[PDB]
Enzyme design. Structure first.
Site, mmCIF file in Angstrom:
data_model
loop_
_atom_site.group_PDB
_atom_site.id
_atom_site.type_symbol
_atom_site.label_atom_id
_atom_site.label_comp_id
_atom_site.label_asym_id
_atom_site.label_seq_id
_atom_site.Cartn_x
_atom_site.Cartn_y
_atom_site.Cartn_z
ATOM 1 N N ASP A 108 6.805 30.716 25.272
ATOM 2 C CA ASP A 108 5.574 31.474 25.277
ATOM 3 C C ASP A 108 4.640 30.894 24.222
ATOM 4 O O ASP A 108 4.919 30.995 23.034
ATOM 5 C CB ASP A 108 5.866 32.956 25.018
ATOM 6 C CG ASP A 108 4.658 33.858 25.193
ATOM 7 O OD1 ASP A 108 4.317 34.199 26.382
ATOM 8 O OD2 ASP A 108 4.003 34.148 24.143
ATOM 9 N N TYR B 223 -2.686 30.410 18.762
ATOM 10 C CA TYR B 223 -1.681 30.154 17.729
ATOM 11 C C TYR B 223 -1.970 28.844 16.978
ATOM 12 O O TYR B 223 -1.537 28.678 15.845
ATOM 13 C CB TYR B 223 -0.274 30.079 18.350
ATOM 14 C CG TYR B 223 0.207 31.267 19.152
ATOM 15 C CD1 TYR B 223 -0.279 32.543 18.952
ATOM 16 C CD2 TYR B 223 1.227 31.100 20.084
ATOM 17 C CE1 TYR B 223 0.136 33.608 19.738
ATOM 18 C CE2 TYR B 223 1.688 32.165 20.843
ATOM 19 C CZ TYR B 223 1.102 33.410 20.700
ATOM 20 O OH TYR B 223 1.464 34.481 21.508
ATOM 21 N N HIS C 120 -5.726 35.786 27.621
ATOM 22 C CA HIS C 120 -4.983 36.416 26.556
ATOM 23 C C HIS C 120 -5.464 37.847 26.255
ATOM 24 O O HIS C 120 -4.691 38.649 25.708
ATOM 25 C CB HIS C 120 -4.983 35.510 25.332
ATOM 26 C CG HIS C 120 -3.873 35.764 24.393
ATOM 27 N ND1 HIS C 120 -3.606 34.889 23.353
ATOM 28 C CD2 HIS C 120 -2.883 36.670 24.370
ATOM 29 C CE1 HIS C 120 -2.553 35.323 22.681
ATOM 30 N NE2 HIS C 120 -2.087 36.385 23.271
ATOM 31 N N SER D 206 -3.193 39.211 30.194
ATOM 32 C CA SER D 206 -2.469 39.771 29.081
ATOM 33 C C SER D 206 -3.326 40.859 28.446
ATOM 34 O O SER D 206 -4.523 40.693 28.299
ATOM 35 C CB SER D 206 -2.086 38.701 28.110
ATOM 36 O OG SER D 206 -1.356 39.243 27.021
ATOM 37 N N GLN E 49 0.992 40.387 30.719
ATOM 38 C CA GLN E 49 1.773 40.432 29.498
ATOM 39 C C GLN E 49 1.177 41.488 28.568
ATOM 40 O O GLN E 49 0.021 41.369 28.152
ATOM 41 C CB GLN E 49 1.807 39.064 28.809
ATOM 42 C CG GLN E 49 2.564 39.125 27.497
ATOM 43 C CD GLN E 49 2.729 37.816 26.761
ATOM 44 O OE1 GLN E 49 2.376 37.713 25.594
ATOM 45 N NE2 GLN E 49 3.265 36.813 27.428
ATOM 46 N N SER F 14 6.449 41.828 21.618
ATOM 47 C CA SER F 14 6.949 42.678 20.554
ATOM 48 C C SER F 14 7.925 43.721 21.098
ATOM 49 O O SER F 14 7.893 44.871 20.688
ATOM 50 C CB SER F 14 5.822 43.299 19.784
ATOM 51 O OG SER F 14 5.077 42.300 19.116
ATOM 52 N N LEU G 106 10.930 44.079 20.272
ATOM 53 C CA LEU G 106 11.825 44.489 19.198
ATOM 54 C C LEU G 106 11.060 45.184 18.079
ATOM 55 O O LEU G 106 11.592 45.289 16.979
ATOM 56 C CB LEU G 106 12.596 43.268 18.687
ATOM 57 C CG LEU G 106 13.451 42.576 19.746
ATOM 58 C CD1 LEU G 106 14.174 41.378 19.143
ATOM 59 C CD2 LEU G 106 14.440 43.545 20.384
ATOM 60 N N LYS H 247 15.099 32.019 14.150
ATOM 61 C CA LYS H 247 16.514 31.854 13.856
ATOM 62 C C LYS H 247 17.237 31.457 15.125
ATOM 63 O O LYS H 247 17.295 32.237 16.077
ATOM 64 C CB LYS H 247 17.101 33.147 13.289
ATOM 65 C CG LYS H 247 16.496 33.589 11.964
ATOM 66 C CD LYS H 247 17.378 34.515 11.187
ATOM 67 C CE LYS H 247 17.260 34.306 9.691
ATOM 68 N NZ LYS H 247 17.761 35.481 8.945
#
Length: 307
Positions: A57, A62, A120, A154, A176, A205, A207, A258
């Site tokens: 993504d 960005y 976006h 989005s 999105q 998002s 989480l 991670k």
């Protein structure tokens, strides 16, 4: 084994996106000085080690195309085993229009096409000299030419989608949105409307509940239950939430730096949730106050409808 959603045009999309740009990695300027070796290294490692089709993504806003492009060049992961989602920066202009944005992105990424191209935001920068209809038509042309294999939007509301549908030759395939147990309707009715109209939701998002995991979590029924499920399945709490999104028919988009979390997200299809468990996560989530991380200044007024 890896699961996929089937879009309204019959194309498949990996049902979790695991390679993304987290907030820490956004850049204000794109220079040699701001090139992030740390980001390119994590993207490369992901492409090298994450099994199956790796769903990336990306977004113009960005300013991390150079890092993605370097990783895409250096990996031996074949192009056909990668699904690239990219997004035209409409809220704060970087390019004049979608065709310019995507042409620039393709070159920086070192690819010939993206797998999904989104607008976006519905809130267009005043400095853009294009309107929504004209931007959508540009996406339709990028779809027809094959530069974007699939197209969508989005952060669109129901009213925004209806504006597109009124002028569309090609119906948007994806919306999105921000979606989590603590934000089950980014804007009023969006989930139900999108699903009834065969527009696939992606959830960014997802989480949010773990990013904002509070001090009194061990006394909240939602977090107690989430821990119970984690222990039942021998999976992480994050994995349980990502799988819940998938079980709600929505594609979770995650952005860890991670590698083991990235692999764990890809591996959510190693287990399942029962119907009861999906409903209970939903219900305990809905009892929680909304948590909204994006488009806050625009959509806080909808928080009363979000749960």
């Amino acid at each position: 084994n890896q699961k996929f959603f089937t879009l309204s045009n019959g194309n498949k999309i990996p049902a979790v996106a695991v390679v993304g740009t987290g907030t820490k990695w956004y850049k204000a300027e794109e220079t040699d000085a701001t090139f992030s070796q740390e980001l390119t290294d994590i993207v490369k490692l992901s492409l090298d080690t994450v099994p199956g089709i790796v769903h990336i993504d990306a977004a113009e806003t960005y300013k991390t195309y150079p890092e993605l492009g370097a990783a895409l060049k250096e990996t031996k992961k074949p192009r056909e085993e990668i699904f690239i989602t990219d997004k035209f920066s409409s809220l704060h202009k970087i390019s004049e229009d979608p065709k310019s944005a995507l042409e620039t992105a393709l070159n920086k990424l070192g690819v010939d096409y993206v797998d999904l191209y989104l607008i976006h935001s519905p809130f267009f920068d005043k400095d853009l000299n294009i309107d929504l209809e004209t931007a959508w038509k540009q996406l339709e042309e990028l779809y027809k030419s094959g530069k974007a294999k699939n197209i969508g939007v989005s952060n669109f509301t129901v009213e925004d989608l209806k504006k597109v549908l009124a002028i569309a030759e090609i119906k948007p395939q994806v919306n999105q949105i921000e979606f989590s147990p603590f934000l089950q309707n980014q804007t009023p009715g969006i989930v139900e409307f999108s699903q009834k109209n065969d527009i696939l939701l992606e959830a960014y998002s997802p989480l949010g509940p773990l990013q904002k995991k509070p001090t009194d979590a061990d006394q909240q029924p939602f977090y107690q239950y989430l821990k119970e499920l984690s222990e039942k399945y021998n999976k992480t709490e994050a994995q349980v939430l990502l799988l819940w999104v998938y079980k709600r028919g929505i594609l979770p988009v995650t952005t860890s730096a991670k590698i083991e979390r990235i692999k764990q997200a890809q591996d959510i299809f190693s287990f399942d949730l029962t119907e009861e468990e999906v409903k209970k996560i939903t219900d305990l989530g809905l009892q929680h106050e909304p948590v909204r991380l994006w488009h806050v200044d625009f959509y806080t007024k909808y928080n009363s409808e979000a749960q």
